[PDB]
Design a binder for this molecule. Structure first.
Ligand code: SF4
Ligand code: SF4
Ligand code: SF4
Ligand code: FES
Ligand SMILES: [Zn+2]
Lengths: 117, 711, 441, 67, 253
């Protein structure tokens, strides 16, 4: 566990993002890792950090439709209620929605989950 | 009388005033349903049970139609095909396309009855879209996804009728009718997790179980709950090494398709603080030991101490099974000890009720006897926190009949109505001499229920003679050809079975002999005065808790999801667990540990196998060889001797009865190690109705979430 | 069962019901030239039952690591000099328990197993399993699927015969036709890899039709190949049919009579070589065969040469059928239009609720097949390929038994080969067209 | 295995439009490998597999309370 | 049934105000007196709230089995702009199927008579419509009324009153193809006798009667929308080019 490519869980995020995720430092150790190039190992980006750099899709309708934007390529079409003063998230892809009726409340919170703008 | 009708051409008889759907399960005729449940009131809402009936212009809801004299019913006609196809189209029109992300997939009535009774394709494509509703916070246990709701009303009927929790409802009207609480409030009911299984769809799911398993990859084991004294029949779902969830299974004599939340949601404590290796205390530290160098270290200590009669002491806990107590009774007996204690307070002295006649310490009117009960007296027990699904049966009988309940002891928030008669023996004496005694006298099927808290009390000697004297005075009401009014309620799974084989302190002469070698057989709630400071302590069990941390040597045993152990419930039903998983690490079976040390100590026990020990068991009491049944106490009236003749002059103190369950979520080692119960207690302390209270998930004050569950 | 514990009535046996031949008309002690002094016990002094159990003929393990073994056969040969006195084929060296593994699969999950039985004839093996499940499902697959399955059924037949006939010529010593014909099969696996995603194990033909529809350029490219495949048949015809070394290696070799070929469970060319007119696609038409014209090659001498002439004719008849399928290809679905059986289109599964529920249940539980059993047989390129499927009424088959043509053929090896030379055994392995994925299963 | 992914389809006659003129080679993915990632077998950069999940059962950390 | 178990679980009977408001007069004047009006199986007087495109809306008490035109043309002053301007009438309240001008001419305002018109007397509310009405808009408004007035207890009316409303809101503006008209006909007949109460009939019947006499109007504006968007609409209201613009369109939509 000498390099950062053998400790950081992902290049974009250092810590684990699941209850059960074995830390990289705890899985790059052992005899099987003694003559190994760490940066040559598969080290993919954490999707938990990426999805949360998306900005909120603002809408006035009570109910929004998300199908993943790909048409048949995306995901099954669903509908998200936006009534709670909170950013509503698509359960398949994580895209954030908010209703403009909470624009003043959300732009008052000390922090949030997604970029409001 | 059973009237006679024909369903699908075949003849069926059934009691009048039955639902027509009920006549179908008798005639072996499958009828689709969503709102109808056998254990709930009929609702008539889904429209999936419509069948054809003669002289009837329109299809009839089979769940709500009373069986008539000579009706002819068609469940397979073009009328029924057209109705089931059309109603499926309606229930699937605003249903969310979330079958991949839903935890009900592979175990869904809506997909199994859509595949069997609906068209293969939807005709709903509206540009307006489907209905979407917002999610709800009803506590730390029940994850909500309310787009999935099909408005069956099963959880509102369960919460209001079965559980006595009238906080859940359906606010709104039309297509915007929404199940939930109006105010965002926690659901406070020990029977809460039962709405997860009742829910036809996955709108009301389990927070601890969310996204972890699918049902087709689960092994199903039919076992017994040991987390209380009822012996609820459970289904243990395992994926290899790990238990995933605990489900109820049908036993109308015991649990009636319900389990409580602690029985349900404490399984996650089976993987967290386990004992997998022998530990010997060396220089104030616990170091690992080989099994040989732990049994040798035990044997050396016993040889050095040279314990005479009754300086060997054994205390057994809530979760111990009978193959261990019968094995431990045979080990201590050949070591010269008859000092066989119990984990509760007052468990190291002779008990107020003895163990000579089984009717002294059982629930003699069955659990099924409450189904007929007309008058019930409660003596020092909170039936909610002791036997939660038995508490519901009392409410069920109460709503549908003229059942009168009174109680003596600490007042409790109850799902049924009752009269508080007092808190101590003086109040109980007036209770029987007063109106409720006459109510107990005048009634058919009268029922006095003594909780195990009384047996723990200073005046159990005096309480138990007072009650039995009332019973013996009032036989032909209490002691009839078919009725037993006397009941003692046990809240631990091991205790009736302990009484079954005599694992109890026989005399104060034994109880007054200070031990120097104490075996804690799964004991963790032991009183600090029952364990000498200078005694050599041996702890056997499966969790590192209060018992293990004061011992000199720990021996890792099995848990109940990994042993085939006999348990006797509060009424004397003899049930066996089935191992769902193997033993962790280097743990052993408990009766093998006891048999193994009998080699080292110099007195090996004859049996070398479970059958040989179950032959030993069946000649301590032959009922232990008759599984799933309750034996009748032949000499019922012999209960007078230990209850009255042996309990006559008692130094009554007048101290009121106590509340023996302070925290429902923490009652044993498994519960005290469960992260899910830790969230139940903490949410109940502060009232946070939020689903992600100490769990993964995003919140307003938690923008980034957390991986921690239970913290 | 219980009565068998002690002695009871003996179960009757074929030896008991033996009957004596009539002496007035009986002529000859051997009406068959297969047993005419070309087996064991034709030499020596005493029989090999007593005082002969101490000696062996020259015994050689012909395979498994052998070219003429074509794979994984252990053919134990007893040679009298260079002559075969007894042939004991030992199989099970590619037995992998396919028929037991099918019982822990859904019906969809078991279909790729059939790709790997006769593993030069994948789409034909798929068809016999797809036609047995469709019969137990009581469904009628659409016309476009039936024409795709017959066209790829004959593309598969040509692929098998290229491997079969030219492997057989390679064993006899002719190398060049093998190389030419493997460019044609290399051409035809593009058609596989264009409709499925595999050159060999397509998993294409499934109960209910075919997995996907053919791509929009495929029929034109199949027709372009078809306009030149006749010349390919003629140039391999040009090196073997009249070759005098080819004729004297196969004519009079591996001779089986018509009445013995039926009694030996022979099917296909092994049967049609003996003069019997029998084709499963003529006698029990399946898919689109009863909608096309083709001839049935039948030999008259029942030898390796007639079997070679019948197979080289089936090249021309398969190419003739393929042309009619290209011409008669209808429009419409390629999957039975019931989503309770066949998976819905991905568009529909992402758009509509009943399509998603059906997609979810078909890939986890599978579809349920109504209870019963069936024997279904098709004209596979190697003979009558059959399957016996027993159905529980659940989503997993209770029993899947494969009737493999080459299992029935390798069993009659000692019957037709004993008395020929070691090279003639090589000739008979290739004419009998064995693939041990189907033999062992 | 030294051929870049889009060109691997062009050399295989799986597409006719070359990655110069192909729009899908323009979707910006900051998480995509910036460098060339070939088959790494027979080198010390060879992929080593591992458990991505935590252990399933946690043992007690012994705490011997003072006598 | 309330006659056994009704209010508070007690024996009960529900009856209309007009039903109860005549019964004392039925006694003080006589059963024969009241049974002197209407047809053979239909007797007595009736109130008639006659709203809509009349030149003088009003309620009136008039004899049952009266021809509707004379009821309209005499008590209420007749159809606005004359009788020829009439297009259609709802002879009961919003829960009875529509009646075109050609059958209104000799229709008795009667319990049995309106039944033969495949309609009902209903509450004897009479909503008349001129030849300047958007009839599908008038019907679709009722389909919107029933979406808001459904209790939500049972599957067919909680899902079918919203589904039918969205179809009707599409059919006003022609976003759909004609074979959907049959699909909407089937939907109403899967509600019609599959419900706890007659509100399922109350929102299915007005739609069915509209299909019964105004399908060419439904067809005319489906055709118009197709030429307006350059293509026949898909099922659900999507445009013909939805798949071209990268939308999600199942086979057969
Ligand atoms: S409840 Fe869940 S699994 Fe069942 S149909 Fe609905 S989304 Fe699918
Ligand atoms: S939450 Fe579940 S149980 Fe309650 S009404 Fe909805 S579907 Fe029925
Ligand atoms: S038909 Fe009646 S019960 Fe059903 S949703 Fe409509 S108003 Fe409610
Ligand atoms: S089951 Fe009878 S209507 Fe729901
Ligand atoms: Zn999405």
């Amino acid at each position: 566990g000498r390099p950062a490519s053998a400790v950081m869980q992902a290049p974009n995020r250092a810590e684990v993002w699941s209850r059960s995720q074995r830390p990289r430092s705890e899985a790059m150790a052992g005899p099987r890792f003694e003559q190994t190039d760490f940066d040559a190992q598969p080290r993919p980006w954490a999707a938990i950090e990426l999805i949360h750099k998306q900005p909120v899709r603002w809408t006035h309708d009570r109910i929004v439709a998300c199908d993943g934007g790909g048409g048949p390529h995306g995901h099954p079409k669903i509908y998200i209620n936006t009534d709670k003063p909170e950013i509503a998230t698509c359960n398949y892809c994580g895209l954030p929605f908010a209703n403009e009726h909470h624009r003043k409340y959300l732009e008052s919170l000390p922090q949030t989950s997604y970029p409001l703008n | 009388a059973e009237v006679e009708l024909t369903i699908d051409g075949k003849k069926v008889s059934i009691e009048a005033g039955s639902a027509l759907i009920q006549a179908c399960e008798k005639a072996g005729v499958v009828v689709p349903r969503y709102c109808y449940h056998e254990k709930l009131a009929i609702a008539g809402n889904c429209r999936m049970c419509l069948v054809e009936v003669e002289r009837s212009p329109k299809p009839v809801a089979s769940c709500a139609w009373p069986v008539q004299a000579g009706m002819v019913v068609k469940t397979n006609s073009p009328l029924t095909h057209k109705a089931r196809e059309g109603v499926m189209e309606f229930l699937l029109a605003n249903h969310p396309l979330d079958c991949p992300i839903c935890d009900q997939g592979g175990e869904c009535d809506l997909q199994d009855q859509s595949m069997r009774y609906g068209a293969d394709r939807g005709r709903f494509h509206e540009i307006g879209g489907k209905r979407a509703v917002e999610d709800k916070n009803i506590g730390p246990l029940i994850k909500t996804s309310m787009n999935r709701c099909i408005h069956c009303t099963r959880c509102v009927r369960f919460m209001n009728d079965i559980a006595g929790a009238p906080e859940l409802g359906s606010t709104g009207r039309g297509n915007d009718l929404q199940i939930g609480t109006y105010l965002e409030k926690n659901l406070d009911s020990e029977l809460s997790g039962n709405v997860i299984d009742l829910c036809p769809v996955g709108a009301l799911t389990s927070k601890p179980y969310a996204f972890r398993a699918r049902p087709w990859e689960l092994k199903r084991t039919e076992s017994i709950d040991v987390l209380d004294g009822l012996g609820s029949n459970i289904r243990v779902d395992s994926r290899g090494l790990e238990v995933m969830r605990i489900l109820p299974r049908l036993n109308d004599d015991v649990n009636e398709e319900w389990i409580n939340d602690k029985t349900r949601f404490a399984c996650d404590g089976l993987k967290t603080q386990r004992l997998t290796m022998p530990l010997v205390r060396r220089d104030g530290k616990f170091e690992p030991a080989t099994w040989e160098q732990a049994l040798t270290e035990i044997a050396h200590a016993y040889q050095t101490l040279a314990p005479k009669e009754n300086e060997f002491k054994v205390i057994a806990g809530q979760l111990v099974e009978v193959e261990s107590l019968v094995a431990m009774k045979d080990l201590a007996n050949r070591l010269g000890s008859e000092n066989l204690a119990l984990d509760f307070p007052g468990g190291s002295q002779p008990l107020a009720h003895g163990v000579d006649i089984r009717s002294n310490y059982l629930f003699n009117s069955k659990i099924w006897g409450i189904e007929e009960a007309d008058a019930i007296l409660l003596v020092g027990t909170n039936p909610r926190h002791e036997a939660a699904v038995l508490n519901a049966r009392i409410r069920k009988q109460w709503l549908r009949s003229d059942l009168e309940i009174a109680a003596v002891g600490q007042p409790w928030e109850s799902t049924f109505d009752y009269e508080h008669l007092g808190t101590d023996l003086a109040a109980l004496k007036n209770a029987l001499s007063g109106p409720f005694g006459e109510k107990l006298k005048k009634a058919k099927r009268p029922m006095i229920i003594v909780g195990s808290g009384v047996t723990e009390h200073p005046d159990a000697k005096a309480f138990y003679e007072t009650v039995w004297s009332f019973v013996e005075k009032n036989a032909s009401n209490f002691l009839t050809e078919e009725w037993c009014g006397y009941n003692v309620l046990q809240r631990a799974a091991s205790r009736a079975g302990a009484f079954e084989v005599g694992f109890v302190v026989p005399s104060p002469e034994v109880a007054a002999t200070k031990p120097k070698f104490v075996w804690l057989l799964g004991a963790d709630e032991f009183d600090p005065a029952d364990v000498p400071k200078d005694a050599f302590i041996v702890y056997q069990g499966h969790h590192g808790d209060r018992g293990a941390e004061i011992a000199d040597i720990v021996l890792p045993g099995a848990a109940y999801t990994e042993k085939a152990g006999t348990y006797v419930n509060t009424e004397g039903r003899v049930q066996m667990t089935r191992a769902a998983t193997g033993l962790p690490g280097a743990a052993r079976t408990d009766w093998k540990i006891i048999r193994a040390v009998s080699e080292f100590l110099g007195v090996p026990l004859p049996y070398d196998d479970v059958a040989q020990l179950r032959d030993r068991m069946a000649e301590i009491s032959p009922a232990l060889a008759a599984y799933d049944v309750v034996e009748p106490v032949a000499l019922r009236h012999l209960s007078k001797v230990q209850l009255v003749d042996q309990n006559k002059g008692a130094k009554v103190t007048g101290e009121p009865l106590k509340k023996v369950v302070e925290n429902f979520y923490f009652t044993d080692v498994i519960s005290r190690s469960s992260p899910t119960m830790a969230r139940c207690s903490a949410a109940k302390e502060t009232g946070d109705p939020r689903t992600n209270f100490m769990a993964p998930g995003m919140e307003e004050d938690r923008p980034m979430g957390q991986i921690a569950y239970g913290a | 069962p219980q009565d068998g514990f002690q002695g009871t009535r003996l179960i009757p046996t074929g030896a008991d019901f033996q009957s004596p031949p009539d002496p007035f008309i009986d002529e000859g002690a051997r009406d068959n030239a297969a047993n005419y002094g070309v087996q064991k016990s034709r030499s020596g002094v005493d029989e090999d039952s007593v005082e002969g159990r101490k000696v062996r003929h020259y015994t050689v393990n012909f395979g498994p690591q052998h070219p003429a073994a074509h794979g994984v056969l252990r053919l134990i040969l007893e040679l009298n000099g260079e002559e075969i006195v007894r042939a004991d084929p030992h199989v099970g060296l590619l037995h992998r328990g396919t028929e037991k593994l099918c019982e822990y699969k859904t019906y969809m999950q078991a279909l790729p197993y059939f790709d790997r039985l006769d593993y030069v004839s994948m789409m034909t093996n798929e068809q016999v399993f797809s036609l047995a499940v469709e019969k137990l499902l009581n469904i009628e697959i659409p016309p476009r699927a039936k024409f795709i399955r017959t066209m790829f059924g004959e593309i598969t037949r040509i692929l098998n015969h290229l491997m079969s006939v030219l492997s057989h010529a390679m064993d006899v010593g002719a190398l060049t036709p093998f190389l030419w014909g493997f460019e044609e099969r290399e051409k035809l696996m593009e058609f596989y890899e264009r409709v499925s995603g595999a050159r060999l194990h397509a998993a294409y033909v499934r109960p209910g039709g075919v997995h996907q529809d053919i791509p929009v350029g495929l029929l034109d490219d199949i027709y372009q190949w078809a306009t030149q495949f006749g010349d390919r048949i003629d140039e391999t015809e040009e090196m073997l049919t009249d070759n005098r070394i080819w004729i004297n290696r196969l004519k009079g070799v591996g001779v089986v009579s018509a009445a013995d070929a039926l009694n030996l469970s022979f099917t296909g060319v092994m049967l049609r070589g003996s003069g019997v007119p029998w084709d499963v696609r003529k006698s029990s038409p399946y898919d689109a065969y009863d909608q096309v014209e083709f001839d049935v090659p039948v030999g008259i001498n029942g030898d390796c040469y007639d079997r070679y002439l019948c197979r080289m004719e089936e090249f021309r008849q398969s190419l003739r059928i393929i042309h009619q399928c290209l011409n008669k290809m209808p429009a419409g679905p390629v999957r039975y239009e019931d989503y309770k059986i066949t998976p819905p289109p991905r568009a529909a599964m992402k758009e509509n609720m009943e399509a998603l529920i059906h997609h979810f249940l078909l890939f986890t539980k599978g579809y349920a097949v109504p209870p019963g059993d069936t024997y279904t047989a098709i004209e596979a390129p190697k003979g009558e390929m059959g399957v016996y499927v027993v159905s529980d009424g659940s989503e997993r088959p209770y029993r899947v038994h494969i009737r493999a043509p080459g299992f029935a053929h390798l069993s009659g090896f000692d019957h037709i080969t004993r008395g020929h030379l070691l090279a003639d055994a090589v000739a008979v392995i290739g004419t009998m067209d064995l693939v041990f994925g189907e033999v062992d299963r | 295995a030294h051929i870049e992914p889009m060109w691997h389809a062009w050399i295989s006659y799986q597409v006719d439009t070359p990655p110069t003129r192909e729009p899908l080679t323009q979707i910006e993915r900051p998480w995509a490998p910036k460098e060339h990632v070939p088959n790494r077998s027979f080198t010390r950069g060879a992929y080593k597999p591992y458990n991505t999940t935590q252990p399933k059962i946690q043992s007690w950390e012994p705490k011997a309370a003072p006598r | 049934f309330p006659a056994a178990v009704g209010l508070f679980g007690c024996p009960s009977t529900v009856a209309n105000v007009e039903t109860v408001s005549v019964a004392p007069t039925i006694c003080r004047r006589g059963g024969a007196w009241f049974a002197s009006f209407g047809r053979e199986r239909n007797h007595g007087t009736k109130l008639f709230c006659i709203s809509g495109h009349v030149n003088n809306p009003c309620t009136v008490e008039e004899e049952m089995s009266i021809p509707m035109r004379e009821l309209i043309e005499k008590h209420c002053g007749g159809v606005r702009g004359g009788w020829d301007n009439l297009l259609a009438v709802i002879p009961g309240g919003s829960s009875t199927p529509i009646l075109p001008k050609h059958i209104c001419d000799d229709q008795l305002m009667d319990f049995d008579a309106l039944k033969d018109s495949q309609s009902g007397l209903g509450t004897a509310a009479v909503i008349v419509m001129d030849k300047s009405t958007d009839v599908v808009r008038a019907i679709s408004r009722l389909s919107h009324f029933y979406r808001h007035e459904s209790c939500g207890q049972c599957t067919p009316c909680r899902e079918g009153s919203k589904w039918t409303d969205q179809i009707m809101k599409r059919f006003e503006k022609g976003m759909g193809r004609p074979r959907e008209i049959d699909m909407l006909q089937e939907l109403t007949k899967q509600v019609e006798g599959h419900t706890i109460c007659a509100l399922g009939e109350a929102f299915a019947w007005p739609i069915q009667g509209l299909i019964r006499h105004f399908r060419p109007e439904l067809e005319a504006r489906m055709k118009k929308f197709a030429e307006e968007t350059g293509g026949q609409a898909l099922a659900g209201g999507w445009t013909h080019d939805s798949r071209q613009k990268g939308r999600l369109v199942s086979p057969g939509m």
